[PDB]
Amino acid sequence: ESVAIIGAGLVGCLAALAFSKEGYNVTLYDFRQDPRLDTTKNKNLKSINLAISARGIDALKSIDPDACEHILQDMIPMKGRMIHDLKGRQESQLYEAINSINRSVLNNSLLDELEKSTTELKFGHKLVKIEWTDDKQICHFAIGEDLKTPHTEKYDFVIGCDGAYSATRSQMQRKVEMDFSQEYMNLRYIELYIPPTEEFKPNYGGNFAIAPDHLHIWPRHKFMLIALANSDGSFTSTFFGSKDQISDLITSKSRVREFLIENFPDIINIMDLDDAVKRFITYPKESLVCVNCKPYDVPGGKAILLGDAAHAMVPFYGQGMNCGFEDVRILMALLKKHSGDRSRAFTEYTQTRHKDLVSITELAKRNYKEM
């Protein structure tokens, strides 16, 4: 059986690994170029690192335990949160724990695992149309941003792992009556950077400016800053705030700078303030979108949506990667239970996963709106 998987993000790569392990003929499509190549300048990394949970790790394990051990070997386990107040005082609240994993390492290592299998990788291919039939599904692509060269191929089924703006989802809406909602959040995030120290810190076991084994949080009124360690001693830092508040700041350089100094006085010693200012000013104005569907599948086991394609969530308050990895594990178990009958498996997936998904996404959304 052949399957076309649309989207080579974290979820798409895991799904491709899972299905190739079960002996399927997998073709993995993404319109981006291969991020492993130095000629690829846009890596499409939404964040440098991620918080992976016990569920997320377990999902990876059940699909390929040897690969999981290899892929996660440099993850950094957190023992608690470190709350920084307005005066820069840090309080340690030991853990619901999470570990820091590098996004590009995770994505690229999964791609590497796929190349040890029969999986066919097709970068630079943009899905534009699917023709649904009772047999094979005809997928139409456009190759390249300039030429948009046509490519077509038939598959037994299609897996939509093409993110919040899923082209597969839209194709499926023509075939089945899908309940669907998209909502643009007022939330904006800005990626910041805490460089590694020059000198090795024996108490931290590396060149870290603050404790590498704590999730750092600067909680404030209607906004917050966080920091999560990387392997090289630096921290990936993120500012979360409303688009209006951010717009009201980026009018002048001095306004942003003063804002940072006033609210996060202890980050001055460890972060390049002027670089931080540029990041506020030149940050992508694209809104975060939350989605929900029902159903997740086309009857007859012809297609299924996983990851952000099926349930894009509010960041921080929701855990999209861990949830998406769990999508894959749950799907594969249903396929096992039904001896490969995708029609029953995909149908039961929708029937049992939807209720859990809506619960999770609503909680994440409700919590962000309570700020």
Ligand X SMILES: Cc1cc2nc3c(=O)[nH]c(=O)nc-3n(C[C@H](O)[C@H](O)[C@H](O)COP(=O)(O)OP(=O)(O)OC[C@H]3O[C@@H](n4cnc5c(N)ncnc54)[C@H](O)[C@@H]3O)c2cc1C
Give residues in contact with ligand X (CB under 6 A): 6-12, 29-32, 44, 46-47, 50-51, 126-127, 161-163, 167, 189, 307-308, 315, 319-322, 324
Which residue in 85, 133, 122, 100 sits closest to 7, CA to CA? 122
Annotated binding-site residue? 174 = no
Annotated binding-site residue? 332 = no
Annotated binding-site residue? 30 = yes
Q: Which residues pair with 331 in a beta bridge?
A: none
Annotated binding-site residue? 163 = no
Helix and strand counts by DSSP (H, E) for the chain: 11, 20
First to last CA, the chain: 47
Q: What is the largest CA-CA distance in the chain?
A: 65
**Is the Cβ–Cβ distance between 293 and 309 less than 8 Å?**
no
Looking at beta carbons only, is 33 or 90 nearer to ligand X?
33
Which residue in 67, 26, 1 sits closest to 339, CA to CA? 1
Least distance CB 258 / ligand X (angstroms):
25
Residue nearest to ligand X (CB): 320
Least distance CB 188 / ligand X (angstroms):
10
Looking at beta carbons only, is 9 or 212 nearer to ligand X?
9
**Is the Cβ–Cβ distance between 14 and 63 less than 8 Å?**
yes
Least distance CB 24 / ligand X (angstroms):
18
Annotated binding-site residue? 165 = no
Annotated binding-site residue? 239 = no
Which residue in 178, 175, 162 sits closest to 302, CA to CA? 175
Looking at beta carbons only, is 191 or 341 nearer to ligand X?
191
Count of C-beta atoms within a 10 Å radius of residue 58: 15
Annotated binding-site residue? 103 = yes
d(CA 28, CA 215) in angstroms, rounded, equals 34
Going by the DSSP 8-state scheme, the letter that residue 10 receives in this structure is H
**Is the Cβ–Cβ distance between 16 and 5 less than 8 Å?**
yes
Looking at beta carbons only, is 206 or 324 nearer to ligand X?
324
Least distance CB 198 / ligand X (angstroms):
28
Looking at beta carbons only, is 120 or 341 nearer to ligand X?
120
Looking at beta carbons only, is 338 or 358 nearer to ligand X?
358
Pick out the residues of the known binding site for L-kynurenine. Answer: 81, 95, 367
Q: Name the binding residues for FAD.
A: 11, 30-32, 51, 103, 127, 189, 308, 319-322
Which residues define the annotated binding site? 11, 30-32, 51, 81, 95, 103, 127, 189, 308, 319-322, 367
